[PDB]
Subunit: 174 residues, 4 copies
């Protein structure tokens, strides 16, 4: 039952995300001119702005590093962009310190092994259906939609509903 999850999302002040496998579907794409490509999902962007609008801080913590991530983050107002960092919990804890925020007030979503401890230790830990078993085992919630296909949108809506901000947001479009 969902109230158990709303209980966890209730006091989130910060939402941090892994990129590959969460914000994208995990494809790493190269071309013959040395150029790299990453694909994001349009409904995730709108869900992230909703969350962000309700006064939640958005962050990226990713093991890889690219201009694509920076660009996607900039247009959605994901305001703390940590790249080239696979020690996710350490990075999260570091953010917690510079914002004056507790881990219990952090939500984190990841698909693989570097994310497991951040997923486990955050107030609200999320993984995805194609997440590795070990990270899923340790999460508070597993999305229905998959990474780069509205897993993020889904969690945004969930946090909004827990904080009584979803229905009002919806209403602005009706």
């Amino acid at each position: 039952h969902m109230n158990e999850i709303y209980q966890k999302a209730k006091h989130i002040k910060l939402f941090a995300m892994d990129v590959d496998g969460i914000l994208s579907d995990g494809q790493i794409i190269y071309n013959s001119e040395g150029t790299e490509t990453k694909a994001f999902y349009v409904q995730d962007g709108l869900g992230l702005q909703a969350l962000k609008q309700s006064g939640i801080i958005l962050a990226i913590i990713t093991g890889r590093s690219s201009a694509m991530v920076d660009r996607r983050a900039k247009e959605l107002g994901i305001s703390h962009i940590i790249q080239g960092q696979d020690d996710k919990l350490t990075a999260l804890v570091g953010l917690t310190k510079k914002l004056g925020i507790e881990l219990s007030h952090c939500a984190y979503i990841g698909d693989d092994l570097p994310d497991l401890k951040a997923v486990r230790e955050a107030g609200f830990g999320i993984s995805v259906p194609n997440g590795c078993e070990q990270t899923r085992a340790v999460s508070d919630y597993i999305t229905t939609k998959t990474g780069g296909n509205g897993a993020v949108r889904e969690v945004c809506e969930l946090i909004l509903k827990a904080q009584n901000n979803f229905d009002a947001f919806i209403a602005t479009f009706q």
Copy 2:
């Protein structure tokens, strides 16, 4: 039963479309050289020309903005291209005024929250299986095929059949 839907599509003079999640599958794609990519579906193009051929005006109303949209629109003869606009109903109403057309004569298709009011208020409102629930709740029809996979083709065929123009079009290929 389908006649209920044909009753609604019967008097459409204008078909307006959201892009992301409707004409594409919702992927937003960036590369390391700062270049953006969007993917469309080939069967949608042919369905749009069929509609267009039968004397329906084609329009795009999209929250984002790109040369890809302009190019795709130009080759199919989507003749009114409104980009960087998320207030879809306002944009639709504006078109209705410059063409001398009523909303009841507009069909509109969208996948997410900015489209809900245009979907609700148009004579024929359409969403897609991966559309947000709120927009689907308010639509006259939900396509079987998904966005960027022939949702548009499907609605083109539907409007054509309602206007007794489909079978004749087909016949030109037989």
Copy 3:
């Protein structure tokens, strides 16, 4: 039962293909620098070389036109490349005349309305699961695998088996 289909593929001398929706999955892809992209399937290439090796002539007949098609055709030895042509039967008949070949000796595969007559009139006509109903209605065979996912590979294997050339080809890899 399959022998009915082998009876039709038995005397094929030429295999002609539509591109979009057959050799690709139907995605039409543009980027912000004005560049177009198309995706093909690796197993189709090998199946086409097998067919080609057994002495069947390979041709493309496509409504659109691009350097991608030319390049893909060149590496597989698809030797007649007709682009910017939607009148597929006329184009096929034209090929039949310059090679001294009958239509009954042509196999053709297509997904949409411009292909229906070529599919109907060729000795062996093929469509795909996501083909429009009208073209599927008129085909001798509908592949199990979808376009850009081994529909072509599948038909190559089928023609090879009808001509007693498949098992031998396989054997060269064992």
Copy 4:
């Protein structure tokens, strides 16, 4: 039962991979500027580093040839990169000789006909669900996940478990 497979992976010293259809999902992608694209999977990379970390040598043997393969191989420490080579067994045997290693100590994964003999003859032979039947017929194991979607990750985990290295690796993330 899985122990039968662990018995085969038990003594692997080298893991060799086909690229197209294994490391990618088989898409061959061209653009209008003459540029080629290939997509890899993020979870495969991490599984390959795990394997590699446990002291297994990683190799690529692919029929095609591109800078994308070289780049992907370089970042994961796939250390022997054989491209433009479809005679996979010969290439594998050649590697076996320059490293002083037996075939029984080689694991190989491939999706199509050029890989069948390497798959058959290696100590541990793997194919994928969308592999051609002939190669699947001759393999010791068929992955559950498909190519470019974690088939490789899956086999990495399997070899690790057979060599009692998986649980320990996992533990470093807990």
